[PDB]
Each structure stands twice: as structure tokens, then as C-alpha cells.
Amino acid sequence: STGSATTTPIDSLDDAYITPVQIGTPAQTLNLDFDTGSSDLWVFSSETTASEVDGQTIYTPSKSTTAKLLSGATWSISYGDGSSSSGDVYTDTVSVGGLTVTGQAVESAKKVSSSFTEDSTIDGLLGLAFSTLNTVSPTQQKTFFDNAKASLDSPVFTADLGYHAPGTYNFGFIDTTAYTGSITYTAVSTKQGFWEWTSTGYAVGSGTFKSTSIDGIADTGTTLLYLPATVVSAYWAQVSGAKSSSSVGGYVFPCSATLPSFTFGVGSARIVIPGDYIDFGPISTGSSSCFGGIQSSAGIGINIFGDVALKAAFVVFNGATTPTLGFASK
Numbered sequence: 001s002t003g004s005a006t007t008t009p010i011d012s013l014d015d016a017y018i019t020p021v022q023i024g025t026p027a028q029t030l031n032l033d034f035d036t037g038s039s040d041l042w043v044f045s046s047e048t049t050a051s052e053v054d055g056q057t058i059y060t061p062s063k064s065t066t067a068k069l070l071s072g073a074t075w076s077i078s079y080g081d082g083s084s085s086s087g088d089v090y091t092d093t094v095s096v097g098g099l100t101v102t103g104q105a106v107e108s109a110k111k112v113s114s115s116f117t118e119d120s121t122i123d124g125l126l127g128l129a130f131s132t133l134n135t136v137s138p139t140q141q142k143t144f145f146d147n148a149k150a151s152l153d154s155p156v157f158t159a160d161l162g163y164h165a166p167g168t169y170n171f172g173f174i175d176t177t178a179y180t181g182s183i184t185y186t187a188v189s190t191k192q193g194f195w196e197w198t199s200t201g202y203a204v205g206s207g208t209f210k211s212t213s214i215d216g217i218a219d220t221g222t223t224l225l226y227l228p229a230t231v232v233s234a235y236w237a238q239v240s241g242a243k244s245s246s247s248v249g250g251y252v253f254p255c256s257a258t259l260p261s262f263t264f265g266v267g268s269a270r271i272v273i274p275g276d277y278i279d280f281g282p283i284s285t286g287s288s289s290c291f292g293g294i295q296s297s298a299g300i301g302i303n304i305f306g307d308v309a310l311k312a313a314f315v316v317f318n319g320a321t322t323p324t325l326g327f328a329s330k
Contacts, residue, residue: 001151002172003099007034007161010121013280014307015223017161018121019169022095023106024064030057030123034169035221036159036195036317037304039133039143040077041094042085042107043124044116052112055120061108067092075107075135080222080300085112089136094144096126099171101148105134105141125221128157128317133193145171145319155319159220160330161311163277179314179328184269188323194219195317196302197325200267202227204235205260209270216303218310218317218325224280225262225273226297226304235262235294242292248283251292255282262294264309266327273312 007017018031023043030043044053046060061067067090076086087110094104109124116122127134131142149155152172160178161167168178189196199214214227232251236242238260242253253259259275278293293308316326 001099001148002153002170003095003097003148004168004170005097006166007169008166009162009164010119012164014161014164014311016122017167017220017307018123019096019126021126023059024061024092025066026064027095028057028059028064030059031121032124032126033122033221034126034128034159035219036128037217037219037221038077038079038125039127039129039131039193040075040107040135041105041124041126041144042075042077042087042109044112045087045108047087048109049111052117054117057123059106059108059124061090061092061106064092066102067106070105070136070139073105073136073139073141075137077135080304081115083113083115085109085116087111089141096144096171097169099148099152101144104144104147105136107136128220129195130190130193132190145317148172149319157317157319159310159315159317161220161307163274163311167311174316179330181329183314183316183326183328184266185316185318185324185326186266188325190323192302194302195323195325199305200265202231202265203263203270204238205275207238209263209265211265214264214303216297216305218305218315220307220310222304222306223308224304224306225294225308226300226306227294228303229296229298232294232296235260236292244296245289248289248291250295252283252289253292255288255290257290264305269327271309271313271327271329273309277308277312
């Protein structure tokens with residue numbers, strides 16, 4: 001089997017991407033944030049504290065003939081941005097782009113943090129990291145990808161995120177028309193539960209490439225590109241007036257600037273992030289200070305190849321017995 005679904009930016013900045021997902025019988029379609037940096041499929045629901053729901057579409061398990069309470073199971077998760085959610089668990093039929101999993105754990109939110117409430121466009125998350133990170137207790141549950149894997153034509157999914165435009169998540173096949181040149185594959189460590197890999201270096205603009213190992217995760221659920229402070233300083237030094245602002249919470253730059261590109265290495269291959277991808281717009285409405293899309297990972301504990309980086313590439317998440325990651329230009 002295979003599946004193919006379009007993923008759409010939630011706003012004009014590409015702050016996140018939503019993908020429609022069919023849950024239950026008859027189908028209830030919710031728009032979920034596909035997150036290769038976590039491993040829970042959770043949804044706003046009829047169980048979510050009413051004051052914490054503001055415009056989201058909810059899953060109502062009592063209206064699904066295939067929903068079953070997973071008795072005794074609870075979940076609770078915190079994300080890198082400080083957001084969180086928790087609740088109980090159902091199993092139900094879940095389909096993405098024509099690919100169907102029966103018995104998928106659908107984690108029903110009883111509580112969500114304010115950032116989730118305030119984002120009316122995201123109805124929940126669909127985790128695509130390794131199932132070892134799944135938070136369901138006392139019986140850990142599998143991700144949608146893990147449940148689908150054996151049925152897939154090939155044990156892979158791909159992320160093809162658009163810049164200010166829709167893109168595609170495919171399951172079970174590699175669309176050879178969706179990228180240019182060849183796909184370069186690189187080793188993955190699953191020891192922390194993430195799609196963790198080692199970039200071979202970087203360049204800023206038309207500058208020379210610096211060969212240096214950068215361990216990080218491929219995380220579709222993080223907006224920005226978080227890299228070591230040395231790398232980030234070297235990038236922003238090429239933008240007149242750019243500075244790190246403690247009050248704002250990172251690097252800002254004059255909105256009048258033209259940003260240089262940023263290149264990252266994948267083995268001997270190179271992925272170029274155009275400068276425009278690094279512009280996250282005014283820090284507040286009407287400001288002439290703009291927020292940067294490359295920020296320091298200092299204090300995170302790991303580097304994060306978030307959407308800013310991934311959307312410059314066609315990315316293969318290869319879930320074979322020994323997982324790997326592939327990157328192609330597009």
C-alpha cells in the first residue's frame with residue numbers, strides 16, 4: 001500500500017504545516033501537524049476542556065463506530081517550545097492520503113496548553129519519530145508509520161514541504177519526479193528516539209564550505225533551524241545590523257535586509273536554503289525588526305533541522321531495519 005497527502009502552511013510565515021487525516025467511522029477529518037520530532041498522535045476532542053478549545057475541529061469518539069477506549073491508558077507530552085497536552089486514549093481507524101491503519105492509538109486531549117488553544121488551525125499532532133518516544137502509559141503505543149510499515153510497498157515516508165506553498169507527505173514510495181539530481185542517504189542514530197543524523201558542514205552565502213560534523217535531528221514539527229552558536233554567529237555576521245536580542249529571544253535583523261543563503265552538507269552533497277526562507281518577518285506587527293530563521297541551539301542540547309532546512313529539500317525517512325535519512329535538492 002501507499003498514501004499521499006498534501007500538507008499546507010498554517011500561515012504566511014510557514015510557522016507549521018497541516019495535513020488532513022481521517023479518523024473513525026464515518027470519517028472525521030482533522031488537520032494534524034505531522035511531527036518527525038515526536039511520537040504521539042493526539043487530537044482535540046469532545047473530551048478537551050471547553051475553555052481550551054477555540055476554533056479547532058474536534059474528534060468525537062462516541063460518534064465513531066470503530067472507536068474503542070484503550071482502558072486505563074493515559075498520555076502526557078511536553079514539546080521543545082514549552083507547549084504540552086495530555087489525556088486518555090482510544091483506538092480507531094486512521095487514514096492518511098488513502099493509507100489506512102486499523103487499531104491506531106488516537107490520544108484524546110483532556111488538556112492542552114495555551115499555545116495549542118490559541119492556534120485554531122492545528123487540530124492535533126501526528127508523531128513520526130520512533131515509537132520508543134510515545135508517551136502512552138502503561139502500555140506504550142506505536143506511531144501511524146510504525147503500524148503502517150509492514151503493509152507499505154517500501155518502509156519509508158517522505159516530506160516535501162513547500163516554501164509559502166503546499167507540499168506533500170508520501171508513505172510507502174519515493175516519488176522520483178519530486179526532486180532533482182540524486183538522493184544522498186546518511187546514517188541515523190535512533191538512540192534518543194529521533195531521526196538523528198550528522199551534517200557534514202555548512203556555508204554562508206557564496207562563502208567557502210566549512211567541513212565540520214553537526215549532529216542534529218530532522219524535525220518537521222519545529223519551525224526554525226537551530227544550530228551551534230558558532231555557526232549561527234557566522235551566518236548573521238553577514239547581515240548588516242543583525243544582532244542577538246535577549247528581549248526578543250534570538251537573532252533579529254533589519255527587515256530591509258536581503259538575506260544570504262545557507263548551505264548544509266549531507267555527506268558530499270549540499271542543500272541550499274535560499275535567504276528568503278530565513279525571513280520570519282516583523283517581530284511584532286509594524287516593526288522594522290525581523291525575526292531570523294536560523295537560531296542558536298545552545299541550551300537545547302541538540303541541533304534541530306526544522307522546517308526552514310527541510311523545506312529546501314526532498315527528505316526521505318527510511319524506516320528499514322537500519323533506518324537512514326535521504327536528502328535531495330528540488
